[PDB]
Structure formats: structure tokens, C-alpha cells
Amino acid sequence: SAGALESSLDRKFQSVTNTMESIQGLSSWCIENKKHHSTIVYHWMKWLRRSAYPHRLNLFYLANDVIQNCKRKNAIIFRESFADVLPEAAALVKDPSVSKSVERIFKIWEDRNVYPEEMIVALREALSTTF
Amino acid sequence: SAGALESSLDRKFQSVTNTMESIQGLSSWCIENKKHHSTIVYHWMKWLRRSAYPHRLNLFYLANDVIQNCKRKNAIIFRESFADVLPEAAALVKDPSVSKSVERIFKIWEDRNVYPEEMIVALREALSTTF
Ligand SMILES: [Pr+3]
Ligand SMILES: [Pr+3]
Ligand SMILES: [Pr+3]
Ligand SMILES: [Pr+3]
To answer: Do B111 and A19 touch (CB under 8 A)?
Structure first.
């Protein structure tokens, strides 16, 4: 389990790209495997730390897709699970090559109340798009 | 205006692809040009009719991105404008190579009340994913 799941997550998080098909395929897999939410987020963050900015952005696209869709898919636990890593993660995507795309994601969450105001403020400060 | 706008829309709608950057770039342009919503939707539909299934799907991704984001961007008129074409458009993406991705988009709209129930029912019937 722990080993099988680690092997899948490594393969999937290494390879996620910027296509709708890549993102939605992996998002669906994550939501199917909601039982393992905490392990999923742990490996997502591991991959975010070890990646360079372009691949960090694709991992943020995956996170956004999961966070958005997990509610209608009866897997709202992912919102709480990702909140564990988002403040640290925001600071790893401050570079202007990617921060505007992440800032957009945070604005979408804010407008829809996906996370509360005070959490989004803390994330935008970490991104350096609000001071 | 009419000619300049037609030339931009042809170029942009021909070329939209399945990447987050392609979709978001064009979505932003559309929202910037909310004054021309009706012309934008007219050319979107023209391109949808003349395209094959794969490119029709990318045009639906663009439509979804506009429809979702136009509210926070003070351009909610696009939701009403796209409603003019969506029933016809749904029927042009019935092929199983793409209908599941479009059905997903319709489910996302339904869950969030982006459009009313009776409109979504009419769209899913046109897609042949509900009978
Ligand atoms: Pr390991
Ligand atoms: Pr490994
Ligand atoms: Pr013409
Ligand atoms: Pr032309």
C-alpha cells in the first residue's frame, strides 16, 4: 500500500504537464484515491520542493483542479489536506515566471470562498503579490 | 473594428490548444474585450462548427474558462452570451472521443449553479450523456 502508492505518486507527480488532459486525468485519480488524501498531499509537496519553477506551476495546476473539483466529487477533505502545505508552497512559486498564474488561482479561490479570506491573504503575502 | 476584431478572433480561435497557458491567455483576452461579447461568441461558434472533434474540445475548454472566470472579472455578460450557442454546440461534441470531457464541464456548471438546472438538462440531452 504505502510502497505501491508512493511508486504511483512519484511517477504521476514527476510527469504532470500543462495540458487539460494531463491535469484532469491526475486530478481524477487523486479524487478516486481520496482515502489516501494525506499521503497524496505529502508526496505532492515533496515533488513541489524538489522541482524547478515550470514544473512547480504544473503541480499548482493539479492542486487547483483537485481543490476545485473535490467538492462535487464528495472528496472535500482535499481542501483541508492541501491547506497544510499551501503557505509553504506559495513561497516556492514567487518567481515572476510563474507567480501571476498562481496569484490567479488564489483569486479564483477567494472569489468563490473556497478558502477563507485570512488564509488567502496569508498565501498572497507568501507569493509577494500582496504586501 | 468589425474587420480588426474578426481577424484577431480567427487567428486566436484557429490556434487555441489544450494547454493551461493557451486557454488562459485567450480567456483573458476575451474578458478584456467584453464590449464585443456578442461578436466573440458568434466567431467562437463559427469555429466550433467548422472544426473537427479535437479542436472542438479545445474551444469548449476556452468557453468553460471564460464562463467560469467572467464573473470575478466583472464580465458576467459572457454567461448569457454563451447560452445563445450552447445547446447547438453541445450536439457537435457528442462523439465519445470528447463528450466525457464536455459532460464534466456541464457537471461543474451544474454543481455551482453557473447555469440553471433546466438549461444543463437540455445540454446533457444534446450531448447524449443523459436520455
Ligand atoms: Pr521516498
Ligand atoms: Pr520512489
Ligand atoms: Pr468571415
Ligand atoms: Pr477571416
So the answer is: no
